[PDB]
C-alpha cells in the first residue's frame, strides 16, 4: 500500500523546486512520481560540451532532443502556414525534466510583462522575491573573454540609439523609459562594468550586453558541468539512491520510473492515482489531501482529460469512461516563442582575425551576446501602453558559423566550407499564434497527442469593402509584420557595423547573404516611402495600385515571405496550457473540485520575456507558499543554497 | 481472473486472419488484445472517399495517417542520406490494424521472390493456396472505365518491348521469361480481355495492365465501402458488441482497448501477460499454452525487449529489470519500399480532352494503372539469377494532378493551377537500405521508439587504389543507381508516348518538367556513350577524367541527385523485423523458449513484390496451420467466404 | 414479467421531456415504449445539411420525411377542396419523435393565443415558466451574417407601417398594441440590437426581425449538429446502451423497438399494455398507477 497526501506528478523544473522546499518546511508524506532516471554519471549530460556531440559514437551522431532515451517526442499536426510541415519538439525525460536536456539560459522576464499581463497577486513586486530565490539557488556564471564582434555590435547600437532618442518617436526599438529615455548599453573597453539584464528591480527591459547566464559551475579541477533542477534540489545528499529521503527529508519518496495514467476519482474529491512501473505492474497511491501536476505544458491537459475533467461532448465522442466536470477550456491557448535566422558574409584581408574566439565553449555555448530590443516604430499591433512603457519584443542573438539547414545551404550556396559567416537571430518574444491540445486515446500516457499550431496563415480577400476588412487582415498578418520588422531591425544595424568596423582599424566588408541584401534595401526604400501603411501590400488585391512602384514593393514582400517559413527553428519554449482564469483560479486550484491543483508552466496566463525556465521555477516556489499558507521561501535569506553533491 | 492459452497480441492484418480461422477450427480459449475500437459507423472510414477528406470539418483537414485518434505516430531518426530530415510513418490503431487506414492494394508477390528468396517450406508452390484463400476472402474489384492515357502508355510499352525482345539483351526491363520471351501487355480496344497481375501460378512477373485491385465492395444502393480485415473476419456476425464470441465462435474474447506492456515470464515458459485498460487498471491474462505476437513491424521487437529476450548488454545498460535470453538479432534488419516522383506537362489544343476521367473515385482511388517492370539493363547490383529469371523491381504508377509537395511546387513553379499535369512513379520494390529498432524506456508501450533508417549516403573517397574500392562504392551507391535507372526508364517511354498520341489522332505535346527534361536527355547521352561504367562518375575524384564530357556528365549526375532526396514519399510498407533465421525458425517459433511465437509481417525474411498487405494475411493463415498441426485453410474450398455484415 | 406504474407510450417531443423530468424528481418505475432506434451515429441525421441530401447515394435522393426507415407514412383521404388529391405527412420514427426529422424552429406562441384561447390554468402567465425552461434546455442559436435582402424587406416594412399607424385603422396587419401602437421593427445597420420574437413576457406578437432560431449547436471543431429531444433528454449520459437508467435515473427503462397495440383493460382501471418486439413476440407490461400517451 502506498498511501499519500502530497502527490507530485513529474519532477520538471517546477516539480523539483516544489517538492524540495515543500519537504524542507513541512512534515507531510510526499510521493514524487517522475518517470525518468538520474543521469548523475552519464558524461554526455554532465559535460555541457556533450550537448554538442563530443561523446556520440560515430554511427549515431544525434542530439539528445531527438534521442528517445532522453526526451518525449510529440509530433505536431501540419502547419498550414509553413507549407504543411510537421514539427517535433521535446519535453525532457529525466529527474529535473526539460532542464536535463536544455540550452541553459536564465532570462527572468521583465517588470512590464508581469505587471500589465499577469493577474492580481502575481505582479512583478509580488513575486520578485521568488525569482531572487531561484536565481540565487542556481548561481549561474558568465563568460569574461573579449570578442571584437560584440564590441562592434554594441557600439553600432549606441550610434543608432542616439538618433532614436532624438526625433521624439515614443515606441522605437532602441528606447528605454525606465532609464529616463535611453537604454544603458554596456561599455566597450577592458573590464568595463557589466550590465546584468536580470536586474532585481527590472530597470532594464531594453538593453545591450555582452554575454549571457548559463547553468554551469566551474569545478576546482578545470571542467565545467551542467547545473539543473535535479542536480540542485534532488541529489545524493537529500534523497537515497533507492528513492528515499535522508534525515531532515525523511518523509520524501521518489518513484523514479513511473508513468501516471489518470487520477481515480470519487465524488468530486480525487482519491487515488495510478502509475506503471518498469516491470509492468500497476500500483495505486492513495491521496489524502491533494495531488500536484507539474508534468509540462503538453502532457498536463492530457492528464486532466484522462482523469475525467474536460469537455464532455468531445471526450464522450472518443469514449473516456468517466466524466467529472465540463470545462471546455482545458488545455486551450498554447503559446510559444519563434526564431527566424539570418546570415552575414565577411570579405577583407583580416576577417579571420575579426572572428576569433567565437567557437562554442563550456561557458558560452555558442552565444556571443548581444542585445534585447523592443517594438519597431512601424509595428501596428502594439498594446495601448506602448507609448508610456517599453516592451520586450525581440531577443537578439549572435553566433559564429552557419545556422541554416543543409537544404537551405544548398539553395543559397553559402556553406561553412567558405569561412565568412556569422548569424543574427531575432527571437520573437510576444509571438501571436495560439493553439490547443487534445487526446486521441483514453488508454495511457502516449508520446504524441493532437497538437494544432498554425503560424503564417495568409489572408484571403473577400468582397467586403476594404474599410472594414483591413482590421482583420492586420490581426491575421500580425506574425508576418513582426518578422518583417525584425528583418528591418537587423538590416539597419549592419551599416553602422560597417562604419564602426572600418573606423576601429578593421578593413573588412559586411553584406547579408541570407536573406539577400537587395531584397532588404528594396524593403527599406518601400518602408520609408510608404509609411505605416507598408503592410497594406501583403494583399495587392486591396490597395488597387497599378503604379509599378507599389507593384514592385508588393512583389518584394511576396518573395521575401518565403524565408521565415523555411529558414527557422521552432522554439521548445512551450507555455500557457491551463492558464489562470481559464481552468484555475489565482490559487492555481482547479475549478470544479476541491483537492487537485496545477502548479507548472501550463498555468501561466502569458508567456514571459525569455527562455521559459525561471518562470516555472518561480511558480513552483509560489505554489509551495500557497499550499503552506505562509511565506518562508520569500523570507529565507538569499544566500542559503541547497547543498551540492 | 482471465486465464487463457491462445493469446493474440494485436488485431492487425495478420491478427484477424489468425484469430478468425484459429477459432473456427479449434475449441481452445482465445483472447485477442487489440488496443483500438471498431469504426463500424464512422462515415469517414467506411466511405473510401473519406480517405480524401470529404468529411473533415474545415478547421482540421488532415489525413487519418496523421490524426492521432487513428494511427500510431513514430518519428524516425534523421536520415543522413536525405539532408537529416525525420519522417513519421503510421501503424494503424483499430481492429484490423493498418488495414483500417490504408490505400487498399493487393499485389501478392510473384513466384520469383518467394521461390528464390524464402526458405524451405515457404516456396511459392508451398503457400500459394493460402494466397488464393485470402484474395478469395476479400474479393476485391477493379474499374472498367476507359481512359486514353492508359492506352497511350500501354501501346508505347508494346512499341518499346518489341525492340527489347530483339537485340538479345537478357535482363532488360520490359522482358518476361515465363511468357517465352515477351511480357503479355494488355490489349487496347473496347472490352479487351483483362490481364490479372495476381495470377494463381505466378506467370506474370513483368506485365502491363490497366487498373488495380482495391478493397471495396459495391453495395446494392450505389455506394462503395471499405472492406478490410476487421470488416471481414471480426464483425457483428461473429463477435458480440461487448467483445464475446457468438455460438460457433463462443470461445473468442476481444478486449478492445488494451495495450500490452510485457509478457511476465517464468523459467523459460512465459506464463502471464499484462495490459492497461482505458479506465487505468492493470490486469493479467494467464497463459497456458502459447502467446501470439501480431503487433506490426515496429512494435513487435519492442514487445520482445520489454519482455526480457534480447541483447543483454544494451538492455542492461538502459535498465530493463529482467533478462531472459541473449539474442542480439532482435528487431534487426528492417526494410521498406520507396517511391520518387515525376511530373509531365501537356501542351496542345485538346489536352483537356486527353485527360478526362482521371479524378480519383471510389473504385480507382487516384490510380490509372499502369505497369510493372524489371531491372534496367545497365543495373550493376543484380542477383546471379537475373539472366535466367525475371525479377520484379519497379512498380510503375500514374495519376492525374500534381503530387509534389507545395515547397517543390514553389521551386519548380509548376502548380495544379495550370492544368497540364500528371505523375509517373517508379516505386522501387527491391530497395537496399536496412535499418534497426531499439527502445529507450523500459516502461510501457510508447508511440515512438529509436528507429534508424539511412537511405542516400554518398561515398567518401579514400587513398586506397580504385581497383579495390570500386566494389564498395557500388554497394554504397546502389540506391542512387537504382533510382537513376528508374529515371531513365520513365524518360525513355515519354517519346513513344508522343509518337503514339500524335498517331492516334491526338495533337498534344508531352515534356517532363520535374525533373527537367534537359537533365534527362543529357543523362541518356551520357549513359549510351559511357556504357555500364556510367556510375563511375558519382565520385569524380576516382575516374580522373579531365575531358569536359565526363566533367559535364558528372556535374549532371551531381545536380540530379537532389531530387530523389527531396521530391519523394516514404512508403508505409515496413517489413522484416524479426526474420526467419534471425530470431525465429521456420516454425515462426522464437528461439530460446518454448511457448512464444511471432506470426506477423516482421518475420518475413524478404520484402515481397508489392503493397505488403496480402503477405501478412498469408502468414496468418500459415501460422494457423502451424499451431493447428493440420492444413484445413489450405483445404477449405476456395468459394467459402466468411459472412459479411 | 414487466410490471410498471409509470408507462409512457412514445418518446416524442413531449415524451422525452415528461420521462426525463419525471424520472429526475421521482422514484417510481418508468417504462418508455418508443418504437424506434437512436440515430446517434447516422451522419445524415446529426449533420443538419444531411436534411438536404448531402449523404444520399445517387440512386435514392429522397428526404427523410418520405423514407420509410425514418417516418410513418399516413395518406390522407382526397381533398375535395384541392382537386381531390391525397397528401402524405410524416410523424417521426425515432427516439425524440418528429424532432429527429424536423426543420428546427422555435416559435413559442404569443400571449394572445393562450390567454384568450386556452382554458383556466393554462393562461400565458400560468405556463410561461415552462416555456422558459424548455427554450433554456435547448438553447438554440441564430445567424449573424449580413444580407441586403432582409434589410430591404425590413425597411420597406417600416415605410408601410408608418402609414398604418396613421389613418387610425385598428386592425391593420402591421400594427402592434403592446408596443403602444407600433411594432418594433429590427434596425438596419451593422450590429444593430436584435429583436427576439420569443420574448419572455410576450410583448411582440407582431414584429420584424432578421433571422430565426434553430436547434443546432456549434461544436468546438467547426461543425454544426442537430440538437433535439432525444439528443438532450435521453443520451448516453443517463440511459444505458441497452435501455437502462444510469445511477440517479436507475428506475428508467427504454424498450427501444416496441409498437403498442392497445391497453388491456379491467373494470374501468386499465391494467395492462401490449407491445410487439422486433423478434415478433408479444409481451405485457403490468400497470400499477397510470399510463401515459405521447404518441403524436
Ligand atoms: C532543446 C531544448 C532547449 C532548451 N533551451 C533552453 C534555453 O536556452 N533556456 C532555458 O531557459 N530553457 C531551455 N530549455 C528548457 C525549457 O525552456 C524549460 O526549462 C522547460 O519548459 C521546463 O519546464 P517544466 O520543467 O515545467 O516542464 P518539463 O520539464 O517538461 O516537466 C515534465 C516532466 O514530467 C515528467 N512526466 C511527464 N509525463 C509524466 C507522467 N505521465 N508521469 C510521470 N512523469 C511524467 C517528464 O519526464 C518531465 O520530467 C530547453 C529545453 C529543450 C528541450
Ligand atoms: C498510409 C497507409 C497506406 C497504405 N497503403 C497501402 C496500399 O496501397 N496497399 C496495401 O496493400 N496496404 C497498404 N497499407 C497497409 C500496409 O501496407 C499493411 O497492410 C500493413 O503492414 C498491415 O500489417 P499488419 O496488419 O501485420 O500490421 P499492423 O496493422 O500495424 O498491426 C498492428 C496492430 O496491433 C495493434 N497494437 C500495436 N501495439 C499494441 C499493443 N501494445 N497492444 C495491443 N495492440 C497493439 C495496433 O493497434 C494494430 O491494430 C497502407 C497503410 C497505411 C498506414
Ligand atoms: C418534415 C417536418 C418538418 C418539421 N419542421 C418543423 C419546423 O420547422 N419547426 C418545428 O418547430 N417543428 C418542426 N417539425 C416538428 C413538428 O412540428 C413537431 O415537433 C411535432 O409535432 C412533435 O410533436 P410530438 O413529439 O408530440 O409528436 P411525435 O414526434 O409524432 O410523437 C410520436 C412518437 O411516438 C412514437 N410512436 C407512435 N406510435 C407508437 C406506438 N404505437 N408505439 C410506440 N411508439 C409509438 C413515434 O415513433 C414517435 O417517436 C417538423 C416535422 C417534420 C416531420
PDB file of N, CA, C and O in Angstrom, chain B residues 41 43 55 57-60 221-223, chain C residues 41 43 55 57-60 221-223:
ATOM      1  N   UNK B  41     -19.304   2.560 -37.652  1.00  0.00           N
ATOM      2  CA  UNK B  41     -20.244   3.610 -38.010  1.00  0.00           C
ATOM      3  C   UNK B  41     -19.587   4.878 -38.532  1.00  0.00           C
ATOM      4  O   UNK B  41     -20.275   5.703 -39.140  1.00  0.00           O
ATOM      5  N   UNK B  43     -18.420   7.426 -40.743  1.00  0.00           N
ATOM      6  CA  UNK B  43     -18.566   7.540 -42.200  1.00  0.00           C
ATOM      7  C   UNK B  43     -17.259   7.771 -42.926  1.00  0.00           C
ATOM      8  O   UNK B  43     -17.143   7.393 -44.096  1.00  0.00           O
ATOM      9  N   UNK B  55     -15.229  14.443 -45.326  1.00  0.00           N
ATOM     10  CA  UNK B  55     -15.948  14.698 -44.089  1.00  0.00           C
ATOM     11  C   UNK B  55     -15.188  15.563 -43.098  1.00  0.00           C
ATOM     12  O   UNK B  55     -15.756  15.929 -42.063  1.00  0.00           O
ATOM     13  N   UNK B  57     -14.069  18.470 -40.984  1.00  0.00           N
ATOM     14  CA  UNK B  57     -14.532  19.832 -40.755  1.00  0.00           C
ATOM     15  C   UNK B  57     -13.456  20.827 -41.147  1.00  0.00           C
ATOM     16  O   UNK B  57     -12.253  20.506 -41.125  1.00  0.00           O
ATOM     17  N   UNK B  58     -13.845  22.051 -41.503  1.00  0.00           N
ATOM     18  CA  UNK B  58     -12.906  22.947 -42.203  1.00  0.00           C
ATOM     19  C   UNK B  58     -11.646  23.260 -41.426  1.00  0.00           C
ATOM     20  O   UNK B  58     -10.607  23.537 -42.035  1.00  0.00           O
ATOM     21  N   UNK B  59     -11.702  23.236 -40.098  1.00  0.00           N
ATOM     22  CA  UNK B  59     -10.540  23.631 -39.314  1.00  0.00           C
ATOM     23  C   UNK B  59      -9.399  22.630 -39.434  1.00  0.00           C
ATOM     24  O   UNK B  59      -8.230  23.010 -39.310  1.00  0.00           O
ATOM     25  N   UNK B  60      -9.709  21.359 -39.682  1.00  0.00           N
ATOM     26  CA  UNK B  60      -8.765  20.291 -39.370  1.00  0.00           C
ATOM     27  C   UNK B  60      -8.558  19.318 -40.524  1.00  0.00           C
ATOM     28  O   UNK B  60      -8.442  18.109 -40.301  1.00  0.00           O
ATOM     29  N   UNK B 221     -27.101  -0.318 -53.116  1.00  0.00           N
ATOM     30  CA  UNK B 221     -27.673   1.020 -53.157  1.00  0.00           C
ATOM     31  C   UNK B 221     -26.976   1.882 -54.204  1.00  0.00           C
ATOM     32  O   UNK B 221     -27.636   2.592 -54.972  1.00  0.00           O
ATOM     33  N   UNK B 222     -25.650   1.820 -54.265  1.00  0.00           N
ATOM     34  CA  UNK B 222     -24.907   2.684 -55.159  1.00  0.00           C
ATOM     35  C   UNK B 222     -23.715   3.347 -54.503  1.00  0.00           C
ATOM     36  O   UNK B 222     -23.136   4.286 -55.054  1.00  0.00           O
ATOM     37  N   UNK B 223     -23.341   2.876 -53.320  1.00  0.00           N
ATOM     38  CA  UNK B 223     -22.244   3.453 -52.561  1.00  0.00           C
ATOM     39  C   UNK B 223     -21.216   2.387 -52.213  1.00  0.00           C
ATOM     40  O   UNK B 223     -21.563   1.268 -51.828  1.00  0.00           O
TER      41      UNK B 223
ATOM     42  N   UNK C  41     -25.259   7.861 -34.404  1.00  0.00           N
ATOM     43  CA  UNK C  41     -24.107   7.816 -35.290  1.00  0.00           C
ATOM     44  C   UNK C  41     -24.427   8.141 -36.740  1.00  0.00           C
ATOM     45  O   UNK C  41     -23.502   8.427 -37.508  1.00  0.00           O
ATOM     46  N   UNK C  43     -24.685   9.886 -39.843  1.00  0.00           N
ATOM     47  CA  UNK C  43     -24.230  11.236 -40.199  1.00  0.00           C
ATOM     48  C   UNK C  43     -25.306  12.097 -40.823  1.00  0.00           C
ATOM     49  O   UNK C  43     -25.241  13.325 -40.705  1.00  0.00           O
ATOM     50  N   UNK C  55     -25.683  13.241 -48.099  1.00  0.00           N
ATOM     51  CA  UNK C  55     -25.198  11.878 -47.964  1.00  0.00           C
ATOM     52  C   UNK C  55     -25.991  10.856 -48.762  1.00  0.00           C
ATOM     53  O   UNK C  55     -25.591   9.687 -48.803  1.00  0.00           O
ATOM     54  N   UNK C  57     -27.024   8.359 -51.382  1.00  0.00           N
ATOM     55  CA  UNK C  57     -26.400   7.758 -52.553  1.00  0.00           C
ATOM     56  C   UNK C  57     -27.195   8.087 -53.802  1.00  0.00           C
ATOM     57  O   UNK C  57     -28.412   8.336 -53.734  1.00  0.00           O
ATOM     58  N   UNK C  58     -26.547   8.091 -54.966  1.00  0.00           N
ATOM     59  CA  UNK C  58     -27.164   8.718 -56.149  1.00  0.00           C
ATOM     60  C   UNK C  58     -28.486   8.108 -56.560  1.00  0.00           C
ATOM     61  O   UNK C  58     -29.319   8.802 -57.153  1.00  0.00           O
ATOM     62  N   UNK C  59     -28.706   6.828 -56.273  1.00  0.00           N
ATOM     63  CA  UNK C  59     -29.923   6.178 -56.741  1.00  0.00           C
ATOM     64  C   UNK C  59     -31.164   6.704 -56.034  1.00  0.00           C
ATOM     65  O   UNK C  59     -32.254   6.692 -56.614  1.00  0.00           O
ATOM     66  N   UNK C  60     -31.023   7.176 -54.797  1.00  0.00           N
ATOM     67  CA  UNK C  60     -32.172   7.271 -53.904  1.00  0.00           C
ATOM     68  C   UNK C  60     -32.298   8.631 -53.229  1.00  0.00           C
ATOM     69  O   UNK C  60     -32.652   8.707 -52.050  1.00  0.00           O
ATOM     70  N   UNK C 221     -15.063  22.082 -32.981  1.00  0.00           N
ATOM     71  CA  UNK C 221     -14.283  21.728 -34.158  1.00  0.00           C
ATOM     72  C   UNK C 221     -14.601  22.655 -35.325  1.00  0.00           C
ATOM     73  O   UNK C 221     -13.691  23.125 -36.019  1.00  0.00           O
ATOM     74  N   UNK C 222     -15.880  22.945 -35.547  1.00  0.00           N
ATOM     75  CA  UNK C 222     -16.274  23.732 -36.697  1.00  0.00           C
ATOM     76  C   UNK C 222     -17.448  23.150 -37.452  1.00  0.00           C
ATOM     77  O   UNK C 222     -17.739  23.563 -38.577  1.00  0.00           O
ATOM     78  N   UNK C 223     -18.127  22.180 -36.852  1.00  0.00           N
ATOM     79  CA  UNK C 223     -19.245  21.501 -37.486  1.00  0.00           C
ATOM     80  C   UNK C 223     -20.483  21.574 -36.604  1.00  0.00           C
ATOM     81  O   UNK C 223     -20.409  21.398 -35.386  1.00  0.00           O
TER      82      UNK C 223
END
